[PDB]
Amino acid sequence: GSSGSSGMSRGRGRRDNELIGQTVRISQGPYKGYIGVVKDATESTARVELHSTCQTISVDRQRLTTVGSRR
């Protein structure tokens, strides 16, 4: 039926799983120039799932260049 959670609040500030799902493009490492979706966000790394190799690899959050369609 039509049921829901009394409160519509998930996180107070900015959840570490925010960047999770965004398109990131590796700039460093052996995967330089590779695209992937951030699956997990680490303190000094980020588990991204490549599109081609369709594999989940961890890379420095910084080493990752957040992608974003432009003109």
Coordinates of all heavy atoms in Angstrom, one line a residue:
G1 N 0.8 -1.2 0.0 CA 0.0 0.0 0.0 C 0.8 1.3 0.0 O 2.0 1.2 -0.3
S2 N 0.2 2.4 0.3 CA 0.9 3.7 0.3 C 1.5 3.9 1.7 O 0.9 4.6 2.5 CB 0.0 4.8 -0.1 OG 0.6 6.0 -0.1
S3 N 2.7 3.4 1.9 CA 3.4 3.6 3.2 C 4.7 4.2 3.0 O 5.4 4.1 2.0 CB 3.5 2.2 3.9 OG 3.6 2.3 5.3
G4 N 5.2 5.0 4.0 CA 6.4 5.6 3.9 C 7.0 5.9 5.3 O 6.4 5.7 6.3
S5 N 8.3 6.4 5.3 CA 8.9 6.7 6.6 C 8.5 8.1 7.1 O 8.5 9.1 6.5 CB 10.5 6.8 6.4 OG 11.1 6.4 7.6
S6 N 8.0 8.1 8.4 CA 7.5 9.3 9.0 C 8.4 10.5 8.7 O 8.0 11.5 8.3 CB 7.5 9.1 10.6 OG 6.9 10.2 11.2
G7 N 9.8 10.3 8.8 CA 10.7 11.3 8.6 C 11.4 11.1 7.2 O 11.7 10.0 6.8
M8 N 11.6 12.3 6.5 CA 12.2 12.2 5.2 C 13.6 12.7 5.2 O 14.1 13.5 4.4 CB 11.4 13.1 4.2 CG 10.1 12.4 3.6 SD 8.8 12.4 4.8 CE 8.0 13.9 4.3
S9 N 14.3 12.3 6.3 CA 15.7 12.7 6.5 C 16.7 11.5 6.5 O 16.5 10.6 7.2 CB 15.9 13.5 7.8 OG 15.7 12.6 8.9
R10 N 17.7 11.5 5.6 CA 18.6 10.5 5.5 C 19.9 10.8 6.2 O 20.4 10.1 7.0 CB 18.9 10.1 4.0 CG 17.9 9.1 3.5 CD 16.6 9.7 2.9 NE 16.9 10.6 1.8 CZ 15.9 11.3 1.2 NH1 14.7 11.2 1.7 NH2 16.2 12.1 0.2
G11 N 20.5 11.9 5.7 CA 21.8 12.4 6.3 C 21.7 13.8 6.7 O 21.1 14.6 6.1
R12 N 22.5 14.1 7.8 CA 22.5 15.5 8.3 C 23.4 16.4 7.4 O 22.8 17.4 6.8 CB 23.2 15.5 9.7 CG 22.3 14.8 10.7 CD 22.6 15.3 12.1 NE 22.4 14.2 13.1 CZ 23.2 13.2 13.3 NH1 24.3 13.1 12.4 NH2 23.0 12.3 14.2
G13 N 24.6 16.1 7.2 CA 25.5 16.9 6.3 C 25.6 16.3 5.0 O 24.6 16.0 4.3
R14 N 26.9 16.1 4.5 CA 27.1 15.5 3.2 C 27.7 14.1 3.3 O 28.8 13.9 3.6 CB 28.1 16.4 2.4 CG 29.1 17.1 3.3 CD 30.0 18.0 2.5 NE 30.8 17.3 1.5 CZ 31.9 16.6 1.7 NH1 32.3 16.4 3.0 NH2 32.5 15.9 0.8
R15 N 26.8 13.1 3.0 CA 27.2 11.7 3.1 C 28.4 11.4 2.2 O 28.5 12.0 1.2 CB 26.0 10.8 2.7 CG 25.1 10.5 3.8 CD 23.9 9.6 3.4 NE 24.3 8.2 3.2 CZ 24.6 7.4 4.1 NH1 24.5 7.8 5.4 NH2 25.0 6.1 3.9
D16 N 29.2 10.5 2.7 CA 30.4 10.2 2.0 C 30.1 9.4 0.7 O 30.9 9.2 -0.2 CB 31.4 9.3 2.8 CG 30.6 8.5 3.8 OD1 30.3 9.0 4.9 OD2 30.4 7.3 3.6
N17 N 28.8 9.0 0.6 CA 28.3 8.2 -0.6 C 27.7 9.2 -1.6 O 26.9 8.7 -2.4 CB 27.4 7.1 -0.1 CG 27.8 6.5 1.2 OD1 27.3 6.8 2.2 ND2 28.7 5.5 1.1
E18 N 28.0 10.4 -1.5 CA 27.4 11.4 -2.4 C 28.0 11.3 -3.8 O 27.3 11.2 -4.8 CB 27.7 12.9 -1.9 CG 27.0 13.9 -2.7 CD 25.5 13.9 -2.7 OE1 24.9 14.2 -1.7 OE2 25.0 13.4 -3.8
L19 N 29.4 11.3 -3.9 CA 30.1 11.2 -5.1 C 29.8 9.8 -5.8 O 30.1 9.6 -6.9 CB 31.6 11.4 -4.9 CG 32.4 11.1 -6.2 CD1 32.2 12.1 -7.3 CD2 33.9 11.2 -5.8
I20 N 29.3 8.9 -5.0 CA 29.0 7.6 -5.5 C 27.9 7.6 -6.5 O 26.7 7.8 -6.2 CB 28.5 6.6 -4.3 CG1 29.7 6.3 -3.4 CG2 27.9 5.4 -4.9 CD1 30.7 7.4 -3.3
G21 N 28.3 7.3 -7.8 CA 27.4 7.3 -8.9 C 27.8 8.3 -10.0 O 27.3 8.2 -11.1
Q22 N 28.6 9.2 -9.6 CA 29.1 10.2 -10.6 C 30.1 9.7 -11.6 O 30.8 8.7 -11.2 CB 29.6 11.5 -9.9 CG 28.8 11.9 -8.7 CD 27.3 11.9 -9.0 OE1 26.9 12.2 -10.1 NE2 26.5 11.5 -8.0
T23 N 30.2 10.3 -12.7 CA 31.2 9.8 -13.7 C 32.5 10.4 -13.5 O 32.7 11.6 -13.7 CB 30.7 10.1 -15.2 OG1 29.5 9.4 -15.5 CG2 31.7 9.8 -16.2
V24 N 33.5 9.6 -13.1 CA 34.9 10.1 -12.9 C 35.8 9.6 -13.9 O 35.7 8.4 -14.4 CB 35.3 9.7 -11.5 CG1 34.4 10.3 -10.4 CG2 35.4 8.2 -11.4
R25 N 36.8 10.4 -14.3 CA 37.8 9.9 -15.3 C 39.2 10.0 -14.7 O 39.8 11.0 -14.4 CB 37.8 10.9 -16.5 CG 38.9 10.6 -17.5 CD 39.3 11.9 -18.2 NE 40.1 12.8 -17.5 CZ 41.4 12.7 -17.4 NH1 42.0 11.7 -18.0 NH2 42.1 13.5 -16.6
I26 N 39.8 8.8 -14.5 CA 41.1 8.7 -14.0 C 42.2 9.5 -14.8 O 42.1 9.4 -16.0 CB 41.6 7.2 -13.9 CG1 40.7 6.4 -12.9 CG2 43.1 7.1 -13.5 CD1 40.6 4.9 -13.3
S27 N 43.1 10.1 -14.1 CA 44.1 10.9 -14.7 C 45.5 10.4 -14.4 O 46.4 10.5 -15.3 CB 44.0 12.4 -14.2 OG 45.2 13.1 -14.6
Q28 N 45.6 9.7 -13.3 CA 46.9 9.1 -12.9 C 46.8 7.6 -12.9 O 45.7 7.0 -13.1 CB 47.3 9.6 -11.6 CG 47.4 11.1 -11.5 CD 48.4 11.6 -10.5 OE1 48.2 11.6 -9.3 NE2 49.6 12.0 -11.0
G29 N 47.9 6.9 -12.6 CA 47.9 5.5 -12.6 C 47.9 4.8 -14.0 O 47.8 5.5 -15.0
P30 N 47.9 3.5 -14.0 CA 47.9 2.8 -15.3 C 46.5 2.8 -16.0 O 46.4 2.4 -17.1 CB 48.2 1.3 -14.8 CG 47.7 1.3 -13.4 CD 48.0 2.6 -12.8
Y31 N 45.6 3.5 -15.3 CA 44.2 3.7 -15.9 C 44.0 5.1 -16.3 O 42.8 5.6 -16.2 CB 43.2 3.2 -14.8 CG 43.3 1.7 -14.5 CD1 44.3 1.3 -13.6 CD2 42.5 0.8 -15.0 CE1 44.4 0.0 -13.2 CE2 42.6 -0.5 -14.6 CZ 43.6 -0.9 -13.7 OH 43.7 -2.3 -13.4
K32 N 45.0 5.8 -16.6 CA 44.9 7.2 -17.0 C 44.1 7.3 -18.3 O 44.4 6.7 -19.3 CB 46.3 7.8 -17.3 CG 46.3 9.1 -18.0 CD 47.7 9.7 -18.1 CE 48.4 9.2 -19.4 NZ 49.8 9.8 -19.5
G33 N 43.1 8.1 -18.3 CA 42.2 8.4 -19.4 C 41.1 7.3 -19.5 O 40.5 7.1 -20.5
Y34 N 40.8 6.7 -18.3 CA 39.7 5.7 -18.3 C 38.5 6.3 -17.5 O 38.6 7.0 -16.5 CB 40.2 4.5 -17.6 CG 40.9 3.5 -18.5 CD1 42.2 3.9 -19.0 CD2 40.4 2.3 -18.9 CE1 42.9 3.0 -19.9 CE2 41.1 1.5 -19.8 CZ 42.3 1.8 -20.3 OH 43.0 1.0 -21.1
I35 N 37.3 5.9 -18.0 CA 36.1 6.4 -17.3 C 35.5 5.3 -16.4 O 35.8 4.1 -16.6 CB 35.0 6.7 -18.4 CG1 35.5 7.7 -19.4 CG2 33.8 7.3 -17.7 CD1 35.8 9.1 -18.8
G36 N 34.8 5.8 -15.4 CA 34.2 4.9 -14.4 C 33.2 5.5 -13.5 O 33.3 6.7 -13.3
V37 N 32.4 4.8 -12.9 CA 31.4 5.3 -11.9 C 31.8 5.0 -10.5 O 32.1 3.9 -10.1 CB 30.0 4.7 -12.1 CG1 29.1 5.0 -11.0 CG2 29.4 5.2 -13.4
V38 N 31.9 6.1 -9.7 CA 32.3 5.9 -8.3 C 31.3 5.1 -7.5 O 30.2 5.5 -7.3 CB 32.4 7.3 -7.6 CG1 33.0 7.2 -6.2 CG2 33.3 8.3 -8.4
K39 N 31.7 3.9 -7.1 CA 30.9 3.0 -6.4 C 31.0 3.2 -4.9 O 30.1 3.1 -4.1 CB 31.3 1.5 -6.7 CG 31.2 1.2 -8.2 CD 29.8 0.7 -8.6 CE 28.9 1.9 -8.9 NZ 27.8 1.6 -9.9
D40 N 32.3 3.5 -4.4 CA 32.5 3.7 -3.0 C 33.5 4.9 -2.8 O 34.4 5.1 -3.7 CB 33.1 2.5 -2.3 CG 32.8 2.4 -0.8 OD1 31.7 2.9 -0.4 OD2 33.7 2.0 -0.1
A41 N 33.4 5.6 -1.7 CA 34.3 6.7 -1.4 C 35.1 6.4 -0.2 O 34.6 6.3 0.9 CB 33.5 8.0 -1.3
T42 N 36.5 6.4 -0.4 CA 37.4 6.1 0.7 C 38.0 7.4 1.2 O 38.0 8.5 0.5 CB 38.5 5.1 0.4 OG1 37.9 4.2 -0.6 CG2 38.9 4.4 1.6
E43 N 38.7 7.4 2.4 CA 39.4 8.5 2.9 C 40.5 9.0 2.0 O 40.7 10.1 1.8 CB 39.9 8.2 4.3 CG 40.9 7.1 4.4 CD 41.2 6.7 5.8 OE1 42.0 7.4 6.4 OE2 40.7 5.7 6.3
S44 N 41.3 8.0 1.6 CA 42.4 8.2 0.7 C 42.3 7.5 -0.6 O 43.3 7.3 -1.3 CB 43.7 7.9 1.4 OG 44.0 8.7 2.6
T45 N 41.1 7.0 -0.9 CA 40.9 6.3 -2.2 C 39.4 6.3 -2.6 O 38.6 6.8 -1.8 CB 41.3 4.8 -2.0 OG1 41.2 4.4 -0.6 CG2 42.8 4.6 -2.4
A46 N 39.1 5.8 -3.7 CA 37.7 5.8 -4.2 C 37.5 4.6 -5.1 O 38.2 4.4 -6.2 CB 37.4 7.1 -5.0
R47 N 36.6 3.7 -4.7 CA 36.3 2.5 -5.5 C 35.4 2.8 -6.7 O 34.2 3.0 -6.6 CB 35.6 1.5 -4.6 CG 36.3 1.2 -3.3 CD 37.5 0.4 -3.5 NE 38.0 -0.2 -2.3 CZ 38.9 -1.2 -2.2 NH1 39.4 -1.7 -3.3 NH2 39.3 -1.7 -1.0
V48 N 36.1 2.9 -7.9 CA 35.4 3.2 -9.1 C 35.2 2.0 -10.0 O 36.2 1.2 -10.1 CB 36.1 4.4 -9.9 CG1 35.4 4.6 -11.2 CG2 36.1 5.7 -9.1
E49 N 34.1 1.9 -10.7 CA 33.8 0.8 -11.6 C 34.0 1.2 -13.0 O 33.1 1.9 -13.6 CB 32.4 0.2 -11.3 CG 32.0 -0.8 -12.4 CD 30.5 -1.1 -12.4 OE1 29.7 -0.2 -12.8 OE2 30.1 -2.2 -11.9
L50 N 35.1 0.8 -13.7 CA 35.4 1.2 -15.1 C 34.2 0.8 -15.9 O 33.4 -0.1 -15.6 CB 36.6 0.5 -15.5 CG 37.9 1.1 -15.0 CD1 39.1 0.1 -15.2 CD2 38.2 2.4 -15.7
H51 N 34.1 1.4 -17.1 CA 33.0 1.1 -18.1 C 33.4 0.0 -19.0 O 32.6 -0.9 -19.3 CB 32.6 2.4 -18.8 CG 31.7 3.3 -18.1 ND1 30.9 4.2 -18.7 CD2 31.5 3.4 -16.8 CE1 30.2 4.9 -17.8 NE2 30.6 4.4 -16.6
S52 N 34.6 0.1 -19.5 CA 35.2 -0.9 -20.5 C 35.5 -2.2 -19.7 O 34.8 -3.2 -19.9 CB 36.4 -0.4 -21.2 OG 36.1 0.8 -21.9
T53 N 36.5 -2.2 -18.9 CA 36.9 -3.4 -18.2 C 35.8 -3.8 -17.2 O 35.9 -4.9 -16.5 CB 38.2 -3.2 -17.4 OG1 38.0 -2.2 -16.4 CG2 39.3 -2.7 -18.4
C54 N 34.8 -3.0 -17.0 CA 33.7 -3.2 -16.1 C 34.2 -3.8 -14.8 O 33.7 -4.8 -14.3 CB 32.7 -4.2 -16.7 SG 33.3 -5.9 -17.0
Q55 N 35.3 -3.2 -14.2 CA 35.9 -3.7 -13.0 C 35.9 -2.6 -12.0 O 36.0 -1.4 -12.3 CB 37.3 -4.2 -13.3 CG 37.3 -5.6 -13.9 CD 38.5 -6.4 -13.5 OE1 38.6 -6.9 -12.4 NE2 39.5 -6.6 -14.4
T56 N 35.8 -3.0 -10.7 CA 35.8 -2.0 -9.6 C 37.2 -1.9 -9.0 O 37.7 -2.7 -8.3 CB 34.9 -2.4 -8.4 OG1 33.6 -2.7 -9.0 CG2 34.8 -1.3 -7.4
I57 N 37.9 -0.8 -9.4 CA 39.2 -0.5 -8.9 C 39.3 0.7 -8.0 O 38.5 1.7 -8.1 CB 40.2 -0.3 -10.1 CG1 39.8 1.0 -10.9 CG2 40.3 -1.5 -11.0 CD1 40.9 1.7 -11.5
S58 N 40.2 0.7 -7.0 CA 40.3 1.8 -6.0 C 41.4 2.8 -6.5 O 42.5 2.4 -6.8 CB 40.6 1.3 -4.6 OG 40.2 2.2 -3.6
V59 N 41.1 4.1 -6.5 CA 42.0 5.1 -6.9 C 41.9 6.3 -6.0 O 40.8 6.7 -5.5 CB 41.8 5.5 -8.3 CG1 42.9 6.5 -8.8 CG2 41.8 4.3 -9.2
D60 N 43.0 7.0 -5.8 CA 43.0 8.2 -4.9 C 41.9 9.2 -5.3 O 41.7 9.5 -6.5 CB 44.3 8.9 -5.1 CG 44.3 10.3 -4.4 OD1 43.6 10.5 -3.4 OD2 45.0 11.2 -4.9
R61 N 41.1 9.6 -4.4 CA 39.9 10.5 -4.6 C 40.4 11.7 -5.5 O 39.6 12.1 -6.3 CB 39.3 11.0 -3.3 CG 38.8 9.8 -2.4 CD 37.7 10.3 -1.5 NE 38.2 10.9 -0.3 CZ 37.5 11.7 0.5 NH1 36.3 12.1 0.2 NH2 38.1 12.2 1.6
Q62 N 41.6 12.1 -5.2 CA 42.1 13.3 -6.0 C 42.5 12.9 -7.4 O 42.2 13.6 -8.3 CB 43.3 13.9 -5.2 CG 42.9 14.9 -4.2 CD 44.1 15.7 -3.7 OE1 45.1 15.9 -4.4 NE2 44.0 16.2 -2.5
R63 N 43.2 11.7 -7.5 CA 43.7 11.2 -8.8 C 42.5 11.1 -9.7 O 42.7 10.9 -10.9 CB 44.4 9.9 -8.6 CG 45.8 10.0 -8.0 CD 46.4 8.6 -7.9 NE 47.7 8.7 -7.2 CZ 48.6 7.7 -7.3 NH1 48.4 6.6 -8.0 NH2 49.8 7.8 -6.6
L64 N 41.3 11.2 -9.2 CA 40.1 11.1 -10.0 C 39.6 12.4 -10.5 O 39.4 13.3 -9.6 CB 39.0 10.3 -9.3 CG 39.3 8.9 -8.8 CD1 38.3 8.4 -7.7 CD2 39.2 7.9 -10.0
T65 N 39.4 12.6 -11.8 CA 38.9 13.9 -12.3 C 37.4 13.8 -12.6 O 37.0 13.4 -13.6 CB 39.6 14.2 -13.6 OG1 41.1 14.1 -13.4 CG2 39.3 15.6 -14.0
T66 N 36.6 14.3 -11.6 CA 35.2 14.3 -11.8 C 34.7 14.8 -13.2 O 35.0 15.9 -13.6 CB 34.5 15.2 -10.7 OG1 35.3 16.4 -10.6 CG2 34.3 14.5 -9.4
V67 N 34.1 13.9 -13.9 CA 33.6 14.2 -15.3 C 32.3 15.0 -15.2 O 31.7 15.1 -14.2 CB 33.4 12.9 -16.1 CG1 33.2 13.3 -17.6 CG2 34.5 12.0 -15.9
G68 N 32.0 15.6 -16.4 CA 30.8 16.5 -16.4 C 30.6 17.0 -17.8 O 31.2 18.0 -18.2
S69 N 29.7 16.4 -18.6 CA 29.4 16.9 -20.0 C 29.5 18.4 -20.0 O 28.9 19.1 -19.2 CB 28.0 16.5 -20.4 OG 27.0 17.2 -19.7
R70 N 30.2 18.9 -21.0 CA 30.4 20.4 -21.2 C 30.1 20.8 -22.7 O 29.8 19.9 -23.5 CB 31.8 20.8 -20.8 CG 32.9 20.1 -21.5 CD 33.2 20.9 -22.8 NE 34.6 20.6 -23.3 CZ 35.0 20.8 -24.6 NH1 34.1 21.2 -25.5 NH2 36.2 20.5 -24.9
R71 N 30.3 22.0 -23.0 CA 30.1 22.6 -24.3 C 31.4 23.1 -24.9 O 31.9 22.7 -26.0 CB 29.1 23.6 -24.3 CG 29.5 24.9 -23.7 CD 29.2 25.0 -22.2 NE 27.9 25.5 -21.9 CZ 27.5 25.8 -20.7 NH1 28.2 25.6 -19.6 NH2 26.2 26.3 -20.5

